[PDB]
Amino acid sequence: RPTVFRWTGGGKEVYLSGSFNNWSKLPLTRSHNNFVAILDLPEGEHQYKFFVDGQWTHDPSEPIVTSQLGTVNNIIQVKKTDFEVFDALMVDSQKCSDGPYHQEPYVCKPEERFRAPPILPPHLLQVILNKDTGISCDPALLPEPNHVMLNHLYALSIKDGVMVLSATHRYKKKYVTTLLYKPI
Amino acid sequence: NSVYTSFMKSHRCYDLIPTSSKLVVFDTSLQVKKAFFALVTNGVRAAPLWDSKKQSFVGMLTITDFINILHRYYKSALVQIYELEEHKIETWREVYLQSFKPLVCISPNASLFDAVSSLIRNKIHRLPVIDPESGNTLYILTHKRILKFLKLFITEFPKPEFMSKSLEELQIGTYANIAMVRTTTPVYVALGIFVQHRVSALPVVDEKGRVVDIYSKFDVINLAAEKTYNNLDVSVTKALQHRSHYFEGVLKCYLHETLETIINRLVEAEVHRLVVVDENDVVKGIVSLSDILQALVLT
Amino acid sequence: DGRVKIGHYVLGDTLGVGTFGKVKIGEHQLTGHKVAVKILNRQKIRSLDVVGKIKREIQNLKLFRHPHIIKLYQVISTPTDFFMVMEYVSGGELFDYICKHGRVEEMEARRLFQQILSAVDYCHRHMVVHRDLKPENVLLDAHMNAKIADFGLSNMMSDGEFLRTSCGSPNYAAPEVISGRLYAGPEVDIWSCGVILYALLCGTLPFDDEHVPTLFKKIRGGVFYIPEYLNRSVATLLMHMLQVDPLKRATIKDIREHEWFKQGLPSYLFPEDPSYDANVIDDEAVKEVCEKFESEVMNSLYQDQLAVAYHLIIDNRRIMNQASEFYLASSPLKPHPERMPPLIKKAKWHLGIRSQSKPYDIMAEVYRAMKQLDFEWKVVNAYHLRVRRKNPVTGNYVKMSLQLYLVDNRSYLLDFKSIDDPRLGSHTMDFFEMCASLITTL
Ligand SMILES: Cc1ccc(Oc2nc3nc(-c4ccc(-c5ccccc5O)cc4)c(Cl)cc3[nH]2)cc1C(=O)O
Numbered sequence: 058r059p060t061v062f063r064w065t066g067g068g069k070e071v072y073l074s075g076s077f078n079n080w081s082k083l084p085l086t087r088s089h090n091n092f093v094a095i096l097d098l099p100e101g102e103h104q105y106k107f108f109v110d111g112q113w114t115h116d117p118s119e120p121i122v123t124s125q126l127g128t129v130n131n132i133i134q135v136k137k138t139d140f141e142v143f144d145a146l147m148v149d150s151q152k153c154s155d156g157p158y159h160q161e162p163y164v165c166k167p168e169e170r171f172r173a174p175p176i177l178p179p180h181l182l183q184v185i186l187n188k189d190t191g192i193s194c195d196p197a198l199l200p201e202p203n204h205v206m207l208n209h210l211y212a213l214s215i216k217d218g219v220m221v222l223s224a225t226h227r228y229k230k231k232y233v234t235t236l237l238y239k240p241i
Numbered sequence: 242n243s244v245y246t247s248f249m250k251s252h253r254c255y256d257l258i259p260t261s262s263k264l265v266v267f268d269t270s271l272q273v274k275k276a277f278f279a280l281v282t283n284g285v286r287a288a289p290l291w292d293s294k295k296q297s298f299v300g301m302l303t304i305t306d307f308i309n310i311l312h313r314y315y316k317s318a319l320v321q322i323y324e325l326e327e328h329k330i331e332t333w334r335e336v337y338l339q340s341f342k343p344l345v346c347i348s349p350n351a352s353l354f355d356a357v358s359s360l361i362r363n364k365i366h367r368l369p370v371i372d373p374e375s376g377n378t379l380y381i382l383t384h385k386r387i388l389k390f391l392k393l394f395i396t397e398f399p400k401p402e403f404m405s406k407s408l409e410e411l412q413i414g415t416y417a418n419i420a421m422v423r424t425t426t427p428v429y430v431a432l433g434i435f436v437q438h439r440v441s442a443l444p445v446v447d448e449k450g451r452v453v454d455i456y457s458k459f460d461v462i463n464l465a466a467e468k469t470y471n472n473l474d475v476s477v478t479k480a481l482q483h484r485s486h487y488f489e490g491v492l493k494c495y496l497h498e499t500l501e502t503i504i505n506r507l508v509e510a511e512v513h514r515l516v517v518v519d520e521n522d523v524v525k526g527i528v529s530l531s532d533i534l535q536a537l538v539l540t
Numbered sequence: 541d542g543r544v545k546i547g548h549y550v551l552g553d554t555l556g557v558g559t560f561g562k563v564k565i566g567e568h569q570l571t572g573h574k575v576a577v578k579i580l581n582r583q584k585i586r587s588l589d590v591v592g593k594i595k596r597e598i599q600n601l602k603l604f605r606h607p608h609i610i611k612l613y614q615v616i617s618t619p620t621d622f623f624m625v626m627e628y629v630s631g632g633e634l635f636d637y638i639c640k641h642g643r644v645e646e647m648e649a650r651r652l653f654q655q656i657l658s659a660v661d662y663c664h665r666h667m668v669v670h671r672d673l674k675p676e677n678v679l680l681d682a683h684m685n686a687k688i689a690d691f692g693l694s695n696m697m698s699d700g701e702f703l704r705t706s707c708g709s710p711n712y713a714a715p716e717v718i719s720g721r722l723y724a725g726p727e728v729d730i731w732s733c734g735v736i737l738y739a740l741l742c743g744t745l746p747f748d749d750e751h752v753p754t755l756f757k758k759i760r761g762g763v764f765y766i767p768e769y770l771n772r773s774v775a776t777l778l779m780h781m782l783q784v785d786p787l788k789r790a791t792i793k794d795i796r797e798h799e800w801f802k803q804g805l806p807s808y809l810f811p812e813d814p815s816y817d818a819n820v821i822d823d824e825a826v827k828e829v830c831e832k833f834e835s836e837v838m839n840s841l842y843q844d845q846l847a848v849a850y851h852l853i854i855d856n857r858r859i860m861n862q863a864s865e866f867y868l869a870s871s872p873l874k875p876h877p878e879r880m881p882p883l884i885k886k887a888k889w890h891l892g893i894r895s896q897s898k899p900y901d902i903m904a905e906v907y908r909a910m911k912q913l914d915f916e917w918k919v920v921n922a923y924h925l926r927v928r929r930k931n932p933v934t935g936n937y938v939k940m941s942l943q944l945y946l947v948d949n950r951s952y953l954l955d956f957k958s959i960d961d962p963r964l965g966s967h968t969m970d971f972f973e974m975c976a977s978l979i980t981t982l
Pocket residue numbers: 061063086087088091092093544551552553554557561562564579580581621
């Protein structure tokens with residue numbers, strides 16, 4: 058399985074040594090700023106160091122491990138999840154993370170807020186039932202709706218104690234605009 | 242032979258549902274008068290009925306319900322039809338059903354063969370397509386929609402030997418006890434002939450004997466739109482005067498004409514039936530989509 | 541020997557830096573086959589909490605199969621980085637081609653625009669918005685074919701929901717994007733394509749300024765210069781595409797209908813065209829076969845009984861699409877026999893319920909109304925709630941989303957939207973009944 062060893066820091070000559078190569082100096086090839094090596098490594102803990110311009114150093118962004126004597130080596134855990142994309146993305150998602158339905162009203166603001174509600178999108182003002190059909194065709198037929206208007210409630214003004222509600226819903230690749238007449 | 246029967250079995254009801262359509266639903270507690278006016282304002286003939294107490298679709302409100310209310314409760318042009326003015330959908334259904342008819346419906350996953358068989362067995366014109374997963378009514382399926390769908394796939398399969406055969410040879414439709422209306426027949430009488438014979442249209446005949454117009458169940462809804470339902474003493478001619486302008490005539494067919502031409506004429510006209518006639522233009526009977534779909538699919 | 545190798549590819553020069561990550565050229569150790577490798581740092585993704593976006597981006601690029609969208613061959617996962625092995629194109633950015641030639645000739649410009657719009661339409665049909673369309677993100681191959689590439693600022697469009705996120709360069713961003721307003725999605729990509737067409741034909745931007753607040757005023761104004769060397773046909777197309785009003789703005793269908801766009805257009809770029817069904821594989825059609833007979837049906841097509849099953853659906857789909865008046869209503873000939881006369885008038889429909897009072901006072905009235913009707917809600921935002929109510933007859937929960945919107949300076953609006961995830965009842969009836977209870981109380 059491929060494992061990346063990148064040196065973000067500066068230098069003219071950079072080497073890599075670890076438990077995987079019996080602590081021997083391996084020369085890293087440089088691009089414009091990065092010194093990299095991609096090695097095939099088995100699952101488990103791996104200790105490593107960096108030899109930059111004749112001096113021993115380590116990457117501060119990677120986990121630190123100090124031995125019984127005092128040498129500082131970076132530790133990397135090669136896991137089974139690291140080989141497959143969707144498994145690696147599942148581990149990365151739960152790492153970022155590290156409620157129920159209630160009848161309690163929400164407070165106006167953490168700190169006093171005059172913040173206004175979002176401006177109504179013009180697409181929702183395109184009422185499908187206010188539009189004319191065209192006489193030639195079946196009166197039940199309607200034009201193809203915008204996906205954005207789906208599930209939204211539309212209503213008529215209450216007249217003679219009866220309220221009328223409508224909404225456009227999807228069934229597979231088809232759309233139904235149901236109307237309901239019910240006394241208020 | 243039996244090509245159309247195999248086609249119906251393969252195609253699901255979903256394939257007939259339009260990409261975008263409207264569905265008018267009424268709560269059973271809604272006044273029947275407001276419900277018929279809503280059918281007019283929304284331009285629909287039928288509407289599924291939602292019982293909010295039972296939390297289920299219990300039936301359908303069609304123009305037949307309006308015809309039945311008028312003929313049962315009309316007394317005079319001098320007195321208002323109290324029941325039409327004050328009855329709720331539920332109270333009307335109680336006196337109408339006395340016959341506790343369950344909801345006749347079809348699933349969108351069920352074949353067209355099942356839908357056609359349901360329309361014939363139950364002797365109905367409008368069948369609601371209800372999704373068993375969501376419980377939502379999606380579309381009101383009719384004989385027109387079914388026949389027009391077959392017309393699009395006629396070129397896709399070999400045409401059977403019966404399509405080239407004459408209507409006289411096949412004998413499809415009614416040719417005895419044809420329920421008709423005269424030019425001077427009052428609307429109330431025409432409504433009585435609908436209730437008694439359970440037919441969707443009555444041909445209009447003049448004093449000389451000629452067929453001038455046609456009074457369909459659909460035409461009755463104009464009494465609600467024009468708000469002329471309170472005077473059912475007027476003639477069928479007076480009731481059809483609203484559409485006198487821009488009316489080609491009574492769409493008829495001949496006994497010598499092939500089944501293919503009858504299907505094409507019915508599909509193009511988007512009408513439920515043609516009046517059959519012999520070599521002479523003499524009325525021999527009627528041929529509707531229920532007769533056509535029974536011959537094409539059921540047999 | 542000591543070179544950096546990912547898979548069997550040797551990593552060379554950096555091609556560029558995208559919205560997320562770094563792109564490097566890859567050359568096959570044995571053959572010399574060239575690929576483009578997008579390197580994503582796992583920690584950088586974690587630090588920005590972009591784990592969800594990266595997941596959706598990979599899912600879509602794997603699903604995508606279009607000749608004018610960069611192909612994703614494979615994704616190589618490592619403990620520190622993600623390596624996206626993609627299709628390499630030698631011609632580089634369209635931006636550099638425009639600069640080299642000054643301005644692209646009408647014939648070549650149209651050809652390139654037709655290819656770009658074909659790719660954009662593919663994304664929209666797959667419910668994906670690019671949101672970063674510019675000639676810098678449009679690449680060219682050896683045969684001068686356009687390929688859209690950076691899907692870093694992309695997002696998926698769902699039923700009933702809107703997008704707000706301020707994405708892209710200001711020069712290619714729509715007036716609604718700049719204003720920080722909610723938008724549907726597709727109209728934003730069409731604006732960007734309009735700017736690309738102007739840049740192809742003119743070799744300049746329609747809205748450009750050194751002072752950012754002036755540039756924003758220019759875009760919002762929508763007033764741009766139309767040069768004399770451009771014919772009235774292209775001018776109208778540009779003016780329809782670069783409309784400030786998203787409702788008045790051109791759709792892909794509008795552009796496809798335009799006389800200028802229609803010229804020398806290949807019949808395989810768009811669906812419903814004469815050569816699309818014969819040369820392009822349909823994913824939805826193959827999926828329909830899977831349930832009837834899951835295995836690959838490619839061998840039978842490249843005549844076997846399995847191949848006929850795929851073409852039967854494709855044929856049946858064409859018949860249903862050819863009968864346009866049977867499935868959809870026309871825009872406003874003898875009238876339909878079932879057309880109903882007018883009653884006696886003409887009542888107009890409106891979204892939710894309007895209120896002229898203060899937004900805090902509206903919200904306070906909502907919480908009280910819900911409590912009386914025994915509702916359970918979740919506060920996701922001060923003006924966005926997720927409400928729930930158990931149906932007594934069916935014993936199932938009914939869910940809806942409440943959102944308060946600003947109409948004008950004194951007017952407000954309470955929007956109702958159903959949430960779908962009832963066998964005894966009806967889902968749509970449950971939503972209407974829950975809405976009715978709240979409307980009557982308020
Ligand atoms: C802008 C950016 C994007 C991504 C990023 O994370 C990574 N950059 C990486 N570069 C590399 C890399 C790959 C090849 C080479 C290389 C080495 C020798 C010759 C040619 C090369 O491309 C150098 C660095 C690798 Cl292997 C992993 C990386 N992971 C770091 C940065 C960054 O510079 O901050």
